[PDB]
Write a protein that binds this DNA or RNA. Sequence first.
RNA 1: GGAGCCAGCGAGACCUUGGCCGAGAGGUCUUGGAAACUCCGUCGUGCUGGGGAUAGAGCAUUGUAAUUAUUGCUCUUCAACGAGGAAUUCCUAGUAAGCGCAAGUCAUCAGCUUGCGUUGAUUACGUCCCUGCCCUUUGUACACACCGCC
Lengths: 134, 42, 22, 62, 247, 38, 142, 128, 205, 206, 49, 28
Amino acid sequence: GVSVRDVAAQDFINAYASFLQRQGKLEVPGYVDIVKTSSGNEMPPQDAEGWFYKRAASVARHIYMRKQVGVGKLNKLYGGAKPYKHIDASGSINRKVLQALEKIGIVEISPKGGRRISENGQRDLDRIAAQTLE
Amino acid sequence: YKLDVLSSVHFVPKPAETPTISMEDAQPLYMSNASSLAPQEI
Amino acid sequence: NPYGLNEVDDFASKREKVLLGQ
Amino acid sequence: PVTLAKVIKVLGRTGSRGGVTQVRVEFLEDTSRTIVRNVKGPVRENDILVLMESEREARRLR
Amino acid sequence: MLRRQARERREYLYRKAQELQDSQLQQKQVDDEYAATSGIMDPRIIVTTSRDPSTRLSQFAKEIKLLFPNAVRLNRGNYVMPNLVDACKKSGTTDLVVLHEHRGVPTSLTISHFPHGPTAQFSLHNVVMRHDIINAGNQSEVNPHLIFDNFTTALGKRVVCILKHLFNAGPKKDSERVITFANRGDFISVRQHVYVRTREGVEIAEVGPRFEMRLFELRLGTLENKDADVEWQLRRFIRTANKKDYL
Amino acid sequence: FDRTAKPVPVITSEVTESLEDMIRRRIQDSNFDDLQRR
Amino acid sequence: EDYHKYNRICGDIRRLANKLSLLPPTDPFRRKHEQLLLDKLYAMGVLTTKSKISDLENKVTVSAICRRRLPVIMHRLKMAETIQDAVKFIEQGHVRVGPNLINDPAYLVTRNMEDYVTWVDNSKIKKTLLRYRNQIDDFDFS
Amino acid sequence: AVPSVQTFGKKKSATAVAHVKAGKGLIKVNGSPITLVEPEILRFKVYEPLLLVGLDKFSNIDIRVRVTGGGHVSQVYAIRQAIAKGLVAYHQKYVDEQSKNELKKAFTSYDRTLLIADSRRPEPKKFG
Amino acid sequence: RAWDLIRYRNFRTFTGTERIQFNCLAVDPSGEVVCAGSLDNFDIHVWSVQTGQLLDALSGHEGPVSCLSFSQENSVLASASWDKTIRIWSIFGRSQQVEPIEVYSDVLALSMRPDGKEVAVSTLKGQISIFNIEDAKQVGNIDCRKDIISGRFNQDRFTAKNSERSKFFTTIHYSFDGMAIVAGGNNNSICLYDVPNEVLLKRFI
Amino acid sequence: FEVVEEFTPVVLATPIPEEVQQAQTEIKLFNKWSFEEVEVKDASLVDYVQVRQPIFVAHTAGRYANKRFRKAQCPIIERLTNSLMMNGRNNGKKLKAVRIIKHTLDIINVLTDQNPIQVVVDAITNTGPREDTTRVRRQAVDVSPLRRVNQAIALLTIGAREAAFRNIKTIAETLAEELINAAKGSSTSYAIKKKDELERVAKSNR
Amino acid sequence: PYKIFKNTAFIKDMFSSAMEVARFEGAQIKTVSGIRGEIKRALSKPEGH
Amino acid sequence: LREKAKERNPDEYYHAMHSSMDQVKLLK
RNA sequence: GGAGCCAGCGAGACCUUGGCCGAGAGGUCUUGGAAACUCCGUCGUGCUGGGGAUAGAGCAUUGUAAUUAUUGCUCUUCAACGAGGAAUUCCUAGUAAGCGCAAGUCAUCAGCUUGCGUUGAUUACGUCCCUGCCCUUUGUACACACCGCC
Ligand SMILES: [Mg+2]
Ligand SMILES: [Mg+2]
């Protein structure tokens, strides 16, 4: 009965980010400590240890909300203002995250392109969703 | 009348020697004509 | 129109068909 | 000590200076007693104002 | 309500057509929009500007307000054009004046006559506002006398009709204030003067502002209706445009 | 080269003098084009 | 279809203007009386635009009166596809002109009332409109 | 068919469509529960009918609200207007009119905007 | 037309510029301003009783003005229309203000409380809604549709219960005591309501 | 004697927090401060410091500028919020004002166990000047209670803003300090100083 | 042309500097299709546009 | 078309108002 | 630094959904033709983690045939500016102000013009006391009432 949308967005991402950190099976690129996630930003994320997993926490939820998602959508989704230019988020990190998730089985290559929420992942996201509520 | 009948939402009735009696008077009977004139008019 | 169009309303129709024809 | 007075009539054509309104007020302590006063803010009837001095009589301020 | 405006617009588009035919037959008076209220009801004018006006355009709008005796200045903060025209039509205004600028330089002036047009658009050149005058003082707001010079063509008479009724009818014979619109090669010079009759002539002093106004569009409808039929428009890319006169 | 459009006029003193003479002449005769009550 | 009644109206208007043509032109009553006729026909909607007397002589026709009939007018307003069908709703009581419903087809609407015609608020006919547009608001009861 | 009613609430460009049917006290906005509406600071605003008339009335119904257009604040007001409107329309269509009158009285007594469109149409306060 | 009843004479006549048909009239308590409304102009004509001239026309309604009423004490003018709104005019004074209040349906009748603090209006839905003039907020409402009695017409092809011919009141008025309203319409019923409790005191055939 | 309107426990398919239910019991500012016990101590300020209508949050989207005296009926907390946002950079940002007031009320509760809404009412009552001067030199005149409320709100907001403009203290804590001191009547609050100076100047020109 | 917005369009390679454009403000221009046009103003960047 | 959209009576009524990829094609 | 997210205007090869590379800029392979704002965190009265001018070194794009400029990205360098004199301009509700988005539709406009939407106030809404601009001083005005030779 529990669903991801039934849980607060902030609570779910922090909880499942911790689970991903605790799980230890998410592949993390080496360059995480030296990247800033965009051109509009200025300095790398402060929570160097866990931002990548929590970055994976956010996109995995978006893939639940929207059945099909691509790297371009995530780039605009995490993009921000800089006249203003509205540069999109870094392509490399989003692509690595999507590859990282489907290794765990949370997501998988959607038809007609993009990533779909895997039924195993869908149950997994619901699992942590119930965890936060309980 | 006929145009009023055709254009009226509600019922419109049809509009209607020897000494003649005045059924209706413009002013009350006890009132006099002289009392009807202002001092300026006089 | 069953019973014809008024003079104002004939005029606008003539304008409409001309624009439609264009 | 301080008295409270309820406005009963907002006088007009008083020749008061701009932003000043001459009012007449009935003291709450003694309803009968009336005093004419000068007020700075927007004012209406039935409103209560504070008088530290209850002896001065309002003189118009041009 | 929406059935009012639709029906009346259709009547108006017809009435102008009949008036045009009647004039053409006469070719072989006051215009219909203004004939109803000509000299009966004093005009009611609203002067406004474009969104986020500069300080100068607000100053220029104020000067235009002083030019017309029955004008009121209205701030256009976020107002939507259908809402602006609809709200003004509710209030019973006769005319709406909208002003545009470029870096604090008045560029355009558009006049729309309610409830059903016409809309006249003008371009402002060599604009001089009275705020450029030191120790100028205050204006006189009596009803001006009007002087129109060198308006000959039918379009010229049309522009005369629109500008005439922005002011009140029946100025006093001895009013010291005169407003003049002088046509010179389609560039109408607008000047405002205060006069005194001397024992051997008349001496005039200008109050300002100075600006040259040229018509470039005239449509049969309110300024909102971008789809309103165009009564007249200025063609510039025509080979004869460099020497063609219309007014 | 030719120019497409009519050049924008300049209000020189002679034009100002000519304009002012017309204004003065009109008021000498009281020939005013102003709206009147009907 | 019988037009004897409207034919009476047309002629009765013609006889009135004719006999007014007989009176002296300078008579104030004649000029006054005519202006009431030109106003009355304009108000009824028989005249789309203000006219003169000779125009009343020829402009007035049976078709003008029939055009003002409520069955005809809703057809122009596209309320009903067909006139006999239009006669049905008005006899079926789904039509209101102003604050009063009219169940009589023979009613003609004046120029001012020409536009206030619409359906009654609780008419099922009106619900089918808003339901297709998906703008049906049950709070307005319509 | 299941008894149901549809109502609209509008604020500026924001428009909210509320469907109120028989149910078990399930309230959703944009497919998510009313508790997760954002901004949290203004959350109580959208809660505000729910508390005024009491949650017992809602326990027997399902409300689904879909919001589009406008900003966050205008969307909140569209939601609250739509909820109140669908509420009262439901108790009219499938419950007594006395309850309807009580609901209208309570809402209007506290704030009439819950039931009315609040449209600040331009007004030329300056005469002329 | 103004009539002096002590001398039974029409001492004045007022008219519009274009002969506007008038349906409603209200007069200043001071007897110096008279206002009329029309179904064709959407505008309130104002005259001076002493002079007979048109002071000005109060514009702002989109709909035909159905009714007018001056406050006996506060002298505020309340106007209602088929525009689904009500406007309070503060004509007297250096500056004039208009306070529009929107309503569920077309207003057919309007009455002014003798105190002048409240206004009641009858709508096409069959609702008597009372509003506070100074605060411009509603204070009460009365249902009317059920209490009204309307008989099926011999030419009507319908049941009276389904008929929507007249389930609204076209006229209303307060009691001078101010706790009751008498209402009438195009129907066979006069209903007397109690404003504070919003209940039917009695109905008359 | 009892009256019961509910014979079945109310459970909603959509879970609602129990705090929201306790708010169903009573209207309470931010679910956290009540309007039942608040009273304006000074009689004159009554009818212009409006606290009888309880509200969850400051925002109301009300129309109070249209006639001359709707501002009296506006809730005092909302008037405060409207006054906090200023200086251009903060213009139009009422949500930040709401956040600031909630944090200030929390601070006022922490420092003083009294009710922060009562503290605000007391501060407005205390810091309202009771006479002022008008330039003719100067002459002493009375002040309308709406002007008293207005100068009170303006003075408190301005003092709190200026105190923390370039100070370690944030806006919320300085606002809470100003409100507490004004309620106490201590001279430490800037608004009390200004009020006393105005009344003194009026006394001199009396 | 290199940027076209309905009738308005930006042109290049006709002039080398904005100074050259400044004199030819007001001149006629036409396309091979015969569309008569006009020089409105020199663009500050790049030169000649 | 714009005037038709502009001048549309909202109140108008008409009686029409009341009313493997390859394997998928064979199935339907 | 992260996350959470809400608009309305707009349609006469190039755009594009999606995959793969790169920290970014930006490349490569294919299919069809919004911000402000809200939550949690780090900072902190220090010209400080505000400010990004100038300067150096690189990684790329666009033409074009030059080692020519052009437009972006990475690092380092880190200036004036600490609320602005005399004076002066404007402003009353969806208004002042903040915020972004779109089209350049015969005049004017090319980071300028217009339009669209989002957040949204304080104060006053009373006065002729000062200033300025006007009206009247044959009731002429149909009753009552008020007035009474500038
Ligand atoms: Mg602005
Ligand atoms: Mg601009």
